[model samples]
Target: MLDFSKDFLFGVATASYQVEGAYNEDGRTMSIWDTFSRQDGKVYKSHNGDVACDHYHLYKDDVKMMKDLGIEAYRFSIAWPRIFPAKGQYNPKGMDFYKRLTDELLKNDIKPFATIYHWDLPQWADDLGGWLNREIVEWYGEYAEKLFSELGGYIKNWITLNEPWCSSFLSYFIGEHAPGHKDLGEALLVSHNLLLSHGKAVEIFRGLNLDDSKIGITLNLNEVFPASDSDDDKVAAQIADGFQNRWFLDPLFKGKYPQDMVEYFGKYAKVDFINDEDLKLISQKLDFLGVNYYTRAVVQKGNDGLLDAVQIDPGNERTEMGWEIYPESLYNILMRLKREYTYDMPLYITENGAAFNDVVEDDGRVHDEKRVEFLKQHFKEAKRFLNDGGNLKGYFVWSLMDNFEWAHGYSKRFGIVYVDYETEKRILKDSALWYKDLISTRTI
Candidate 1:
């Protein structure tokens, strides 16, 4: 039997743009997702979060469902476009929704973990160059300061940004996300500015001095493995690791970008954006570290231009997203973080879950056995880390309900609770029941 610490939180996660769909209501303006998803061939099936789950209007019922499921904590994000629909504008009506949402969570005795930004950049910010512009540091700070001054008492845990790599490389270099641009140079610039904005938010939180409040950043990280024993494969794996893990980790904990990555990326992009004192602010002490892990990377030498590393698929079992189902990497990556970068600092698996081909059977139940097995294996690895003296505080499922998965769109479902997009009804899948049982037992 695998067990977890009694105080370890069992929770779920959902982003604002993905779940809260009233895209234009309550004075909310267009986010980059809104514009990008509307473009031809940008998102799968041309799907958008126009009315995703309708959580905007049905949060009370959703929260009630969460209560029935025995969720101890719920991690959600605030839509920047909702809070500040326009430049130099503050919308209390948009802020009221979160207040109501938080109130419902508190009433149900669920701890609320709020992420300030989760890749939903307001259209105005994108118009002004978004993360590529250093001025976003001040813009993001202003947005954060307002939330702190208003919601500080009720919301104790805050995450500054979710997955800066996605905001930078995935969107810019790979051109798979919103504001898609295939330029290595622009992605590097965006990466620097995004980290700066994170620092600015932290600095503001410290200035406010909110009692009992904690702030940190969330990164989508993976363990990189060389596909072969060849020297070139080994070197490629290290380069991939720095590109994905160390690039963000070093600036936050070690107070410097990985020199290897800086030198490697410099050959293809501009590394001159990094300035003195940027790392000082970027590396400001954090209360916790949130990591979103889904799969691991196995790579070999390639001419990918960016990392010069190629991903190798060993024909392993995969998810609907085509991600390899390697749960042991969950333990390996956390142990690596402890041994190398985050030594004993509080860590949270802020997002961990898999997308599978979920179907509602004739009996009105979604028997997603694959997802159940996926979670069981991953949670077991988390317990393994706990037994080894890892200070993992919590594990948040990737999503609370099926919603608009960007790029892939609504095609991939990664939720324990199934949502019938046809009618916006929430159905607890067998995986949800399994998780409820696990939470009640604290064992797997």
Candidate 2:
């Protein structure tokens, strides 16, 4: 068994759109995801999160399950569609749902961490240019201020934006996510605006003077790898890291964008949108940093690609979602953040788990042993890092239950607890039982 510090926390996480399925309940308006998933061939076999695990109506039971699992914390995001309903339209009832959720978590003595945004951009915002427009900074500030003033009382730990990389580049350039638009210029602009919005939200959080509350941004960071040991491959890796990792990391912590990437993207992107004060705002002091890591990218110089680099599989075992299961990468990323970015600041593994082909056995149980081993090995890496005096504050498994897997829809299951979408049944998988024991003993 690996020993963890007394302050090291164990928890579960779920995004609002991926779990809370009361889509049209109350004053909730449609988010970009709702509109995107409704389009033909956008989601898997037209599957959507219309009634995802029915958590909206079954949150009480969800809270009980967390208590039963013996976790110390819960990190969830508030649906912007539910909070705002429409552009500049204040909806008090939308927040009432989160208030109830927070109350339940507190009632059970479970600490609550709230992620302000998790890619569920309200449709109205998308119509108004979404993250591409600089005005989005103001829009996000309004929404975040609403949350801080309303939900801040209960959620002392606040994550400003979850995975801006997915929100911008993935959705814009890659065209794999909501409001899909395949344009490098658009992706670059969207990335800048997303960071701007994050900065504005943090500024608002600072102005609130809520000393008891902690605010930060959650980045889906990774360790980029080269396809081989050639000089071209090493440069390709640096270029890959330039935009993929440092594009966000440098500006957030170092108050500047990577120069190499700026020049590399000279044809597609521009720095005109970035004002004299933008980087300053973006690099303001953060209380903590949330890292949602899953896999590493192996890339090399290519004849044709946006970055002139192409991704190649490293021949590692992959999850059901095709993401390579690399546990040491978690330790690698945390060390990089501390040595290079956060500088001894608190860090949290806000999302780290694998999606496996989970199935129920005839003995009335789901034997998800692969996921259990996956987490156990990752936990060992974390323990090793902590023993070396790393500032890893906590770990929150990717999901609380198998809800929605986004573009993959409900196909990939990353939850310890299996959710039967049809009947909305929550059955503890072997991984969940294993997690319960780990939590009980504070060892792995």
Best by lDDT: 1
Instruction: Please list the Cα RMSD from the true structure of every candidate, rounded to 1 decimal place.
Output: 1.2, 1.3
Tens-place lDDT per residue, model 1, 9-96, is 9999999999998999989999999999999999998999999899999999999999999999999999999999999899999999
User: Please, what are the lDDT tens digits per residue for candidate 2 over residues 1-444?
Assistant: 448766678999999989989899999989999999999988898878788888999999999999999889999998988888887899988989999999999999899999989989998998998888788899899999999998777899999889888888889988989998998888888888888888899888889898588988899888898899999899999988887789999899989888888877886666566665988988999999999988888898897456778879888788887888898898898898878989889999999998998888888799988898899999999888898888888999988899788888999888999998878999999999999998888876
What global local distance difference test value does model 2 have?
0.88
Q: What are the models' TM-scores?
A: 0.98, 0.97
By summed lDDT, the worst window of 10 consecutive residues in model 1 runs over 303-312
What is candidate 2's CA lDDT for residue 283? 90
